[PDB]
RNA sequence: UUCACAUCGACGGGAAGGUUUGGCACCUCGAUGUCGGCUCUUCGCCACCUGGGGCUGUAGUAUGUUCCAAGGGUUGGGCUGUUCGCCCAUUAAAGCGGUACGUGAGCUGGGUUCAGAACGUCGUGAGACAGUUCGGUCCAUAUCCGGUGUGGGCGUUAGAG
RNA sequence: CUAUAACGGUCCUAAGGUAGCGAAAUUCCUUGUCGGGUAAGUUCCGACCCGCACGAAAGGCGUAACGAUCUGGGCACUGUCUCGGAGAGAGGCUCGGUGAAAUAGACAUGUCUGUGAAGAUGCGGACUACCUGCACCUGGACAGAAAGACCCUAUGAAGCU
RNA sequence: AACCCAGAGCUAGCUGGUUCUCCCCGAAAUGCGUUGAGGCGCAGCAGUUGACUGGACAUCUAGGGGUAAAGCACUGUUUCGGUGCGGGCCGCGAGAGCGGUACCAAAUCGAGGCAAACUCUGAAUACUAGAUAUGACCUCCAAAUAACAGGGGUCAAGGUCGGCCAGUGAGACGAUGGGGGAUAAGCUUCAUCGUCGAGAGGGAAACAGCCCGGAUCACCAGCUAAGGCCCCUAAAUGACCGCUCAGUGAUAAAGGAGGUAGGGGUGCAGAGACAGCCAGGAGGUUUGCCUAGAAGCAGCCACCCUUGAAAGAGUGCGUAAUAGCUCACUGAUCGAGCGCUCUUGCGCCGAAGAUGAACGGGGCUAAGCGGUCUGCCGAAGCUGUGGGAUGUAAAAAAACAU
């Protein structure tokens, strides 16, 4: 004994998962070419 | 057994800080004994509170190397004024009143 | 292992902060024990690695023990924690840092203050590490 | 064998042979047949 | 005898356990029935005895200690309501525990927490003492899971012995 | 001899326990020492005495007889026990007839571990298990029974002083 | 202290109960007083209504404080040495004197700390008080082409007094600074914030209080956050650099270690090394004492010199002790990589419980952990499309903001 247990909530900032490496906590989303406007998509004129 | 626990609970700070506004016979420093001396303009109480005699600006300074010296003045400047927003707000309540 | 006037009876707990400044370099003695682990160390430990390194130098050489206790834990009995009027008189206890030295040893032969300031080590509750005057 | 959780050598002629993970003393004296951790 | 470590290990230190005494008081006061015995389990080990081994300040016979080992075993009584609290006679030994201090919809009620009564003491007094002493109806025709037995339908691709 | 004080001095009250009895239905420590009884007896009998807190009509001490009284040891007698066994009767069991009960949110109602108002069939992972009868046992469903009787609270109720 | 009827539907600050729809706003669990603390009164925080308002957010500058840290001027303690005052002791002698002691102690000095009720100093934030801007969109008019300034119309937003009225008054955990406790508790008590309370959804296996995030609705549409990409379950068993061989990867220390990849220092390596085979390995001398004996090896003192390649009054065993044995040291062959040292990273032992593997399982040597670059999955979040509702507001809308 002598040593505390970690409960609900504190067991939870222990075991929760982390992205514990810089690089992946880094990244950001892949961008895209602008893609130049659409046209409309619907018309009464028929 | 426990024999302690009675504190009082009293409260003594500094009311007006350099450079606010001071009004007339407002005090400046409530004090248990003279932190702050009396300067100019202020008046010693007795129980050494320090207020303040003419409207203006309390100035903290060194009256002595280890003294505080608290003083007031006139300060009265800036009637100029830059602000479109309080015009802004007035101009609202009565555009919006004659619409409603 | 005690000081001798009582100003206040209790004082109430602190806390370690790591050692920065003041890493008392050396001032006596030549080899020194430095702790690296912030923790207390009472009286008692006090008194078992200065009987250790006393008994072992044996021969020569001058103990040094570089930090007095001088602040008292109190222990209170087993009537359900009401009011803490009493314990003071038990044991003291010297808040020791990181980076403070422990003892100090001198006129001993190198390794001799190895095997002394080792065994001293032993009897104590954080891990340490013996310095030369350098 | 003394299955002691750390000592250390002490003959003079102590080997310290790990074997199967277990540090391990072998000394000609057996009083000296130490196995570790 | 010399010899720190065959054996005991002062002075102090670092842990695991969760079963003693405790600290909190989180569930349970439209209720979670207490101590000890009986019967019946089953599990853990850090091992008491039986299986194998080192080391021994082991000549042998005894041992002392540690190491792997839970497969098994782990008496009968006298005293007390009272699990190492204990003398008797053995015995290979006559372990420590967990299981709501296992087990009261299974059992007894010796104890304690009911009403009677008394002793010592406290209280002027009614009364009282986690002091003592004698007496004091512990209820039950299993729905379900569980377990022990035993069947039937049906599956087994045609149907059966 | 050493001890225990036959006998003395001090404050004290109104005075400082007489006779008997005594570890006692009163002695806590305490299974108090010792003797008898027992193979072994914290119970028991006889004594000692530092009576925690016995004691003279809330009587003291002892008594022949009497007790569905409490208590200890005896001889005879035995299933109380060792260590069970067989038997007869009434139930249980099956068939014909009549036919309740308490309980009941709905239940298509597994085990181990983990979790969780910190002791789950109802959540998670893994294992296990054809459907459904009947007899049998009672570990769970914090099973039924009585809005606990212990503990506390209420500027609750009531009884006694 | 009967039973029935009556006052009596007694009283209960205590328990239980309180039924149909939608819409908007939506708390608190704090202080104070209370025969009061599992009540109530006031404040504090909702609603709704009427004025007067000015902000709120960011930025910057002032003003006081003594906290964190530091410090020994103060107070209180605190070790090491200096100094010696003065005192005790020996006595000489019938007075105090020069002194001596490995002597006890008061001020001081040098070195050296420590303190919630210590400060010569002293931040960051917080607080108070000032000025300084500009938020979101539109429609625009004049543009080559933007931008913005030019206006106009909206929308969004703070408060300080009041009116009518509530509920709340033991919160919980997490982060931090602390008291109490044992720097024990999912303990208790306060101060500043977050979530839960009153809040869903995804990650966390399950799992109020941790992470992202805020749910008006529809959608068999898309992009992402926290977290992830072998199977059970979506998505690369994808790239290259390293490190682990224990199933670690899920849990705990002191201590131990020629485990393992590196690093920081150190000397040695043809006036050749650590390996081994080797050879040699003393004279004084039995060192003096003690002891029966002590002769290197019970114990203690001197602890050197001579000889030489090299020998320590001998390293260990042993002998009654001697002797004996062997180490250190030293030359030759073989042959040029080996000692020492502290720490980094990942590991091993230390690390054991009671129903049955308990850590999601299958498993894995990468599907583990350290590092970087790319694609993807991932929610009720954001987008896209289409309805509803509140006000803003006074009218068809339409447009915002919720």
């Not at chain 1, 002598?2 to 906590?25: L, N």
């Not at chain 2, 426990?2 to 400046?28: E, F, H, T, W």
Request: some cysteine.
């Amino acid at each position: 004994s002598s040593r505390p247990q970690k409960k609900g909530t504190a067991h939870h900032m222990k075991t929760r998962p982390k992205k514990t490496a810089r690089w992946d906590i880094k990244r950001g989303p892949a961008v895209y070419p602008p893609l130049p406007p659409l046209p409309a998509e619907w018309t009464i004129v028929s | 057994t426990k024999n302690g626990r009675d504190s009082k609970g009293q409260r003594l700070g500094v009311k007006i800080y350099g450079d606010q506004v001071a009004k007339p016979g407002a005090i400046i420093i409530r004090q248990r004994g003279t932190k702050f001396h009396p300067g100019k303009n202020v008046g010693i109480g007795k129980d050494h509170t320090i207020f303040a005699l003419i409207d203006g600006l309390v100035k903290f300074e060194k009256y002595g190397p280890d003294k505080k010296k608290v003083s007031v003045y006139p300060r009265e400047i800036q009637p100029e004024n830059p602000n479109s927003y309080r015009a802004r707000k007035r101009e609202n309540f009565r555009l919006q009143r004659e619409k409603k | 292992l005690s000081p001798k006037r009582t100003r206040f009876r209790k004082q109430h707990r602190g806390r370690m902060k790591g050692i920065s400044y003041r890493g008392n370099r050396i001032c006596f003695g030549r080899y020194a024990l430095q702790a690296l682990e912030p923790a207390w160390i009472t009286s008692r430990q006090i008194e078992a690695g200065r009987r250790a390194m006393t008994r072992n130098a044996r021969r020569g050489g001058k103990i040094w023990v570089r930090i007095f206790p001088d602040k008292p834990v109190t222990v209170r009995p087993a009537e359900t924690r009401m009011g803490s009027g009493k314990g003071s008189p038990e044991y003291w206890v010297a808040v020791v840092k990181p980076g403070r030295i422990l003892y100090e040893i001198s006129g001993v032969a190198e390794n001799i203050a190895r095997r002394a300031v080792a065994i001293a080590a032993s009897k104590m509750p954080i891990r340490t590490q013996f310095i030369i005057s350098g | 064998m003394k299955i002691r959780a750390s000592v250390r050598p002490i003959c003079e002629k102590c080997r310290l042979i790990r074997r199967r993970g277990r540090i391990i003393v072998i000394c000609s004296n057996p009083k000296h047949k130490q196995r570790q951790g």
